[PDB]
């Protein structure tokens, strides 16, 4: 029943780690304690310089072996307890009680909230790497949950913790449960409680605001490194960690009509789809304002017919327009002379049969506009397939990407025209 | 098969790695080959789908075990051959030649240049972590070297490569030899040449420009992460990677009075020393032009007397001045009414705590020269806040080299220093003591 | 099951500890390993400087806390395995199998021999601190023993090993089992074998020779530090670690008639008793050949009457002689002129107290026989100077006419007739049947 | 409840006043905790009161005791410990809590009160340098705030501070305690309180004192050797040595891979070894000057001379160059080619294993040495046909240079000479040993 206390979540500029360590040492003078950090914390932690208390520095160093930054090599015991800063040991035998709870139960992780201002609460959590998304919500089976929000001591076996790909990546409260929920592991929120530090850290408003800003930066760098572009919550709140109007798009130049994310066995990053939807809405608005006849085309019409949205692995939007109405829209006659950046940041280009509207100068997610003209009662272009004009007389309202778009009438027939029978019900899933 | 080809230095957007892997397989279909990358290379490498060729993705991922990001997981042979993009295997029996050479020699690394436009050259290298410096130079004992500049296949034992802390940190050409040289290991540049790829990568000026921009960015991040603040060639062609006029100073606020670098078992970043020398020179220039009597004080006078420079673990400069001369200098007169940024960015302030003056390098970089006003009563120099000393030490002042210029010092400064610090202090430096610091705090 | 490997038995000048530690690291790269030494070994051990392999220096040091020299603070695991130099991990998971047997069995220690030229064997062991003796013999209930002889990996719980007073005193093979056997613990000798080092230490006869010497010196210092004077084996072989003719006696000058070892709740060291018996045997042989009438006196007679030997907490021997006979013995004649060293190294001298003689084992070892001269006044034996003990009294001469044989200290000695009445006259009724310390007003 | 445990460690079993000491403290408070600590059971018996608050702590391994029994903290349940020397007696009541009150209100982690004996404690300064194996004592400039005490004092400090040291009760406590506390930068405050002397003071006769001092001196010498204190000095003088000498082996023995054992221990060269090196250098130089052998400081010896006029503190030998053509002028050198020569003052002169150089050892047992490297002009260059080769004008002429306490000869413009051999800026950038580096590079 030997447990190593492992401290990872603290701020060098303001912490209660010395009190934390001394509290556990008072219950057992030989208590193994590992404080982990990326670089040597300054001001000095001034931990007891005793063999059972050790500081593990996790970044590479010119004068250290590979083993010196691998944390399992500091942990000899069967069980490990992640303790956040602000916790202290008061009553004895709490770690042993958590161990017997873990062995008695069926959850590979047990947790005991710390009585801070934000004690841990259960949460549900669903990770979809394919969609670059993590969704949180209220946990139906509490005290059994997928993740925790707030402060808690977490206990698990060392073999379980250190076989994870990133066991001590910060913030631990986000990184750990992303990895354990993806593996189908559960955490049991026990009824035990650890007391708070008698002199808690981040006592002033400046200190707390400084810590929250650097914590938000670490959380953003973590999610970007691990492929989470979107955190969403039950209730609707969204947290974005991908591209936007002032950045480049997430994947860059496609070759051979296969974007990079497909080889990573993922679909389109949700931030990229968001920009495409917003550009589709903007362009349609501009076109309808100028009185230009447009209709959904290609995979955009297909996605609209299938589920009213962009096909989740597509990376552009295709609209058809009447060649005759091109002149009615200022952005487009300007696009003939050269690239036009309008007042809202969108970039209209002609390149090439067609026009292309990019989300911004830096973010090259685009809507392609393909002009057709009626010559035979058939709609046709001039460089390269054609379709009869009666599919556009009239056009029908069709939900797409958050707004009501225009589609050819009888568009399921139109889609079997362009793609073959059964296209809507048989999606061509990437493999 | 005893060697595993490992490819780490290449660019996703333009490379010849397929030709590389193919060239080694054309000589032995069973040859073990590992292409290592942080993320899946795009466009697809389309490497042969055989068991002995593996793509090693070294970044941690939510869906993978810890072992997947450890490069030793992918190598099961005794040696590793680090092959740069642009190389190719043509003459059979070349890796076995490098094995025989390394076995018979005393160097732990052997290398063969590749016949590109930039073939490997032999270099000397010493790494001082205390001084945060990588000193390069021409290799006196060539073809036994400390580092290589250029393209080469480097062969060493897998157990050696993967015991390094950062075995595949990029650029490998920089990261590997910083680690091996610090360990006292040599690389032996053999009389063997690998051919270049028949379609070499980065052939256009544009491709090269993008590769070089990314490569320099990776080098800069690598040196900062590893605590190399200064790179030099033959003591010149200095390359800096630390603080400057526009940044914070490297160590920030001292709580000790023991700056952070002492707990890291190093000395003052050269980076910071340079700013201190710059500021001391500028302040002395200002004091002399304004007619302010100054002299080197405390550890600055001690360092000047010892070796004519700042003590390499100190972090400021101290000067004494006559108090009655303060009025002669506009920055100092302005410093008593509040903080003044002068025309060259230096910040002159009057620390109300100690009744002294402080001149910062810049508004953001708080390396400073301190000015201690003394005034004579009864022929003793004294001040009213806190050692006092007889004025005859200042009558007259003598020249003394310090920090790249000639400074003023008290006469009989060795006596002066001995009365302030004790006898023999010039000869017995209080060298930093990590063990003791670990004990006292 | 987590097991820390702990290495204590090795020589700095010649060892295979690097091979040992690497052999366990090849089975588990994070295997916790503690090498313990008294001082920093030179030449350098050059262990892997990785966090799971640590060097524990048990010396005091000005710049270290108390914890730095307490080995338990280096061991965080439930179990610890003492591994000797010259051993090697080859099979996977032997430590796990040893843990399993310890859990399943009743012994607090389990052991696996090492395939050296001298694998561990199973031994019985009784420790008697009161008698300063460790008695070894063949194991009656093997493979369950009190002690081992030879090289073995010994696995036990850290809480058990580090609760011992001297868990890592060298030689561990002697020190550990002296402590565990005294506590009634057993060591189970398992049917598992660790391999020997591929390049074993002490490869040359010279290197071996200096190693056997410094081990012998360490063992001797260990037994003296722990108060083991005598070690015996099943064949009857004895090794001594105390008194001899060439040294000082073990205990020094006695105040209050109560020697220092009694307050340590120990009896007379077995080496001091041996010297006392060989001195008694010699002195009696000299007096008989010289024609001096002697009889067992005081506590020596009492011990003879009880069990034919020196009282086990006594520290001298007392004999009475007719004073008219002193002139018959050359040593006694010389002793009145001064201290005499005789043909066998014994020292004869007239004492510095009450007109009696004293015979020392040697010049350096002052264990002695005291000779008390008596003369008959009127059928009553008496002296002119008397020490202030209840045992120093006049007595009737008829007790000496005639003397009777009585076994004492391995030989037949002369005793007063009716020695029971003689002893009760000098000590009070029932003295033979009621043993007590020389002075129970201080210690009983 | 009492907050101080009296601890008695400094006493002699054959002659002490410990029973009086214990009784005096129990007479102010019968429940006062008192601990007498000893390595073995003191004989003759102490016969201390058989009450629970009086305990004999035996600090010896024993076959029939648990680990806790030999640990002194086992016996202390109070926050504070008062180390009381034998010869003290408690008379004025409440002296211990005045000392507790002083300690809490002050800023020294130790407070002390002298005992009114023949040798009352006096305040001292103490600098401990493990790197130089030296304890430097002197008068205390900021008394009554000290680093160490000399004499008899009751010393009070927190139990957790005392029992956290490596050797809290090592004898003599008056030496071991302040070596450890001064190294930690702790201070002792000599309070203006005084304890009374025992009514019947111990060691009252000259013979008893002689025995007591002999054993104490023996304990002190063993303590400084075990703790690595080779030299004790008072005001920089009155040197007291505890290392090697002319009749012993050198401290670090045989060197493996030019890395002497002291470097791995994160220290520099022992001061006894440096002293012998300076003696041998001065002697060899004097012999060479009297015999007419031209010599010059070479290598690291010259480097130390130019830098600070002494052996570099982590070097362990001295190197001199000589003209080969002058070897015949020296008797000891002439004999050195034949075989090893012990000269009239015990120094040993040898021609080397190979590499053609001469070696002069301090003595037959102590192998600290000066090396002599013979050169000869071949053109204008100095060479040994088996050290760097350098132009001969650096020797035309030689210059005086302070070194190791005398004046030695050096190559002219030794600064240029040194950078030709070692590299630019060598005099100015010394790099003391790097044990962490050493740990990485064997
Ligand atoms: C994760 O998956 C389940 C179905 O397997 C789903 O019902 C649940 O809502 C998902 N998690 C969240 C937080 O929505
Ligand atoms: C991963 O788990 C396996 C099996 O429990 C174990 O052998 C290994 O040591 C673990 N990895 C660690 C703890 O880094
Ligand atoms: C790993 O590197 C360290 C250097 O710090 C060394 O102590 C250790 O022996 C190395 N292990 C191997 C197998 O090279
Ligand atoms: C140990 O003591 C037991 C119990 O009296 C006894 O039977 C046995 O013979 C003794 N063994 C030895 C080796 O003395
Ligand atoms: C102790 O060191 C201080 C500071 O280095 C010095 O001023 C003082 O003279 C030293 N004292 C002794 C006795 O060496
Ligand atoms: Ba499409
Ligand atoms: Ba200073
Ligand atoms: Ba008797
Ligand atoms: Ba040298
Ligand atoms: Zn995106
Ligand atoms: Zn800097
Ligand atoms: Zn004896
Ligand atoms: Zn020495």
Cα gap B305→D42, rounded to integer Å? 59
Residues A282, A402, single domain; the answer is yes
D176, D87 Cβ separation under 8 angstroms: no
Q: Check CB contact under 8 Å for D168 and C66.
A: yes
CA–CA gap between residue C15 and residue C199 (Å, rounded)? 10
| Backbone φ/ψ region at C418: left (φ over 0), alpha (ψ -120 to 50), beta | left
Q: Phi and psi (nearest 5°) for C381?
A: -80, 135
* Closest-CA distance of chain A to residue C67, Å: 6
Q: Note whether D267 and D313 are same-domain residues.
A: yes
How far apart are alpha carbons A398 and A403 in whole angstroms?
8
Rounded to the nearest angstrom, the distance between the alpha carbon of D269 and the centre of ligand 5 is: 21
Pairwise CA distance, residues C336 & C122, whole Å: 58
**Does residue B258 share a domain with residue B188?**
no
Q: What is the DSSP letter of D184?
A: T
> What residue spans of B162-268 are helical by DSSP H?
172-182, 205-225, 260-263
D117-136 b/e (C-beta count within 10 Å ≥ 16 → b)? beebbbbbbbebbbbbbbbb
| Pair A299, A352 in one domain | yes
The nearest alpha carbon in chain B to D425 belongs to B307
A164 Cβ partners below 8 Å, 6+ apart? A176, A179, A180, B65, B66
Kindly report the backbone phi and psi dihedral angles of residue B216, in degrees, each rounded to the nearest multiple of 5, phi listed first. -65, -40
User: Around Cβ A217, how many Cβ atoms within 10 Å?
Assistant: 10
Provide CB contacts within 8 A for C362, sequence distance 6+.
Answer: C245, C246, C345, C346, C347
| Nominal resolution (angstroms) | 2.2
Give SS3 for A163. coil
Look at strands B368-377 and B317-322 and give their pairing. parallel
Q: Bridge-partner residues for A404, per DSSP?
A: A399
Look at residues C185, C169, C107 and name the one whose alpha carbon lies nearest to residue D62.
C169
CB distance C322 to C292 below 8 Å: yes
How are beta strands A187-189 and A109-113 bridged, if at all? parallel
Whether C75 and C22 map to the same domain: the answer is yes
Breaks (C-N over 2.5 A) in chain A follow: 351, 384
Choosing among A13, A14, A18, A42, which should be mutated to test the B contact, i.e. which has the most B CBs within 10 A? A42
Radius of gyration of chain B (CA): 28
Phi, psi torsion values for A254, nearest 5 degrees: -80, 140
Does D440 touch chain A if contact means CB atoms closer than 8 Å?
yes
CA A383 to chain centre: 41
Last residue of a domain, one of D218, D243, D268: D243
The reply to whether ligand 2 has any atom less than 6 angstroms from the CB of A159 is yes
Measured CA to CA, the distance from residue C393 to residue C398 in angstroms comes to: 15
**8 A C-beta contact, residue D49 and residue D35:** no
The answer to whether residues A221 and A362 belong to one domain is no
In this structure, how many other beta carbons lie within 10 angstroms of the beta carbon of residue A193?
Answer: 17
**Which residues are near ligand 12, the ion (C-beta closer than 5 Å)?**
C 242-243, 250, 269, 271-272
Query: CB within 8 A of A366, min separation 6: which ones?
Result: A279, A316, A317, A356, A357, A358, A359
Q: How distant is the Cα of C263 from the closest Cα of chain D, in angstroms?
A: 8
What are the pocket residues of ligand 3 if the criterion is a CB atom closer than 6 Å to any ligand atom? A 65; B 159, 163; C 48-49; D 440
Tell me how far apart the alpha carbons of residues D87 and D262 are, in angstroms, rounded to a whole number.
Answer: 41
Judge if B224 and B284 occupy the same domain: no
Range of the domain at D379: 244-442
* Number of domains chain C contains: 2
Interchain contact, A165 vs B260, CB within 8 Å? no
Q: C116 and C229 share a domain?
A: yes
Helix axes D299-308, D414-421, angle to 10 degrees: 130
Q: Which two tokens stand for residue A73?
A: 């090599």
Q: How far is the alpha carbon of D375 from chain C, nearest alpha carbon, in Å?
A: 34
CA atoms C132, C138, C141, C142: torsion sign: positive
Sequence-separated contacts (24+) of C419-427 with Cβ below 8 Å: C419/C296, C419/C301, C419/C304, C419/C305, C420/C305, C422/C301, C422/C395, C423/C301, C423/C302, C423/C305, C425/C393, C425/C395, C426/C298, C426/C390, C426/C391, C426/C393, C426/C395, C427/C302, C427/C390, C427/C391
Answer yes or no: do A179 and A84 share one domain: yes
Give the other-Cβ count within 10 Å of B261's Cβ. 22
| A298 and A234 both lie in a single domain | no
Element (H or E) spanning D404, and its range?
Answer: none
Residues of B (16-75) whose Cβ lies below 8 Å from A = 40, 42-44, 59-66, 68-69
Distance (Å) of CA A342 to CA A286, A325, A330, A360: 11, 19, 10, 10
Task: Name the closest-CA residue to atom 2, ligand 3.
Answer: A65
SS3 of B256, please?
Answer: coil
Rounded Cα gap, residues A38 and A40, in angstroms: 7
Do A228 and A332 fall into the same domain? no
Residues 6+ apart with CB under 8 A from A360: A245, A246, A345, A346, A347
Distance CA A268, CA C90 (A): 51
Q: Which of A24, A29, A30 to mutate to test the interface with C (most CBs of C within 10 A)?
A: A30
Last residue of a domain, one of A242, A269, A302: A242
Ligand nearest to the CA of C128: 4
Q: Which residues contact D99 (CB under 8 A, 6 or more apart)?
A: D4, D82, D111, D113, D154, D156, D191, D193
Domain end point (choices D225, D243, D261) = D243
Q: Could you tell me if A227 and A280 lie in one domain?
A: no
Is residue A197 within 8 Å of A15, Cβ to Cβ?
no
Confirm if B164 and B154 have CB atoms less than 8 A apart.
no
Look at D424 and B182 and tell me if their CB atoms are within 8 Å.
Answer: no
Structure tokens that stand for C378 in this block? 């009127």
In terms of DSSP H, where are the helices of A37-171?
A: 94-104, 158-162
Query: Do C82 and C114 touch, CB atoms closer than 8 A?
Result: no
């Amino acid at each position: 029943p030997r447990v190593t206390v492992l401290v990872r979540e603290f701020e060098a500029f303001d912490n209660a780690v010395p009190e934390l360590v001394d509290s556990f040492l008072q219950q057992d003078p030989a208590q193994p304690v590992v404080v982990a950090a990326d670089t040597l914390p300054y001001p000095p932690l001034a931990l007891p310089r005793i063999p059972n208390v050790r500081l593990a520095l996790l970044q590479p160093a010119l004068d250290r072996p590979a083993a010196a930054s691998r944390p399992e090599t500091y942990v000899a015991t069967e069980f490990v307890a992640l303790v956040p800063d602000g916790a202290r040991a008061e009553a004895p035998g709490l770690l042993e009680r958590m161990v017997e709870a873990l062995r008695a139960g069926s959850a590979r992780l047990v947790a005991a909230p710390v009585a801070t201002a934000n004690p841990a609460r259960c949460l549900a959590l669903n990770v979809s790497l394919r969609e670059w998304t993590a969704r949180y919500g209220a946990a139906p089976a509490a005290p059994r949950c997928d993740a925790l929000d707030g402060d808690a001591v977490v206990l698990l076996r060392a073999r379980d913790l250190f076989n994870l790909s990133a066991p001590l990546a910060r913030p631990v409260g986000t990184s750990l449960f992303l990895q354990t929920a993806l593996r189908g592991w559960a955490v049991q929120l026990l009824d035990l409680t650890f007391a708070a530090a008698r002199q808690p850290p981040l006592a002033t408003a400046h200190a707390r605001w400084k810590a929250e800003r650097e914590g938000r930066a670490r959380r953003a760098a973590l999610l970007r490194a691990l492929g989470i572009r979107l955190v969403s919550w039950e209730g609707g709140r969204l947290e974005w960690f991908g591209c936007n109007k002032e950045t480049t798009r997430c994947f860059g130049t496609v070759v051979g009509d296969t974007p990079a994310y497909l080889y990573e066995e993922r679909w389109t990053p949700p931030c990229c789809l968001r920009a495409l939807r917003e550009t589709a809405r903007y362009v349609v608005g501009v076109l309808e304002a100028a009185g230009v006849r447009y209709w959904l085309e290609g995979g955009s019409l297909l996605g609209a017919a299938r589920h009213g949205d962009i096909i989740p692995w597509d990376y552009d939007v295709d609209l058809g327009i009447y060649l005759e109405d091109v002149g009615n829209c200022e952005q487009l006659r300007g696009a003939e002379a050269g690239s036009v950046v309008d007042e809202r940041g969108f970039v209209w280009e002609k390149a090439g049969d067609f026009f292309r509207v990019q989300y911004s100068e830096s973010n090259h997610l685009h809507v392609d506009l393909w002009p057709f003209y009626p010559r035979n009662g058939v709609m046709t272009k001039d460089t390269w397939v054609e379709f009869p004009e009666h599919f556009l007389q009239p056009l029908v309202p069709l939900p797409f990407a958050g707004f009501v778009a225009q589609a050819p009438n009888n568009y399921r027939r139109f889609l079997e025209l362009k793609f073959g029978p059964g296209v809507i019900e048989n999606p061509q899933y990437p493999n």
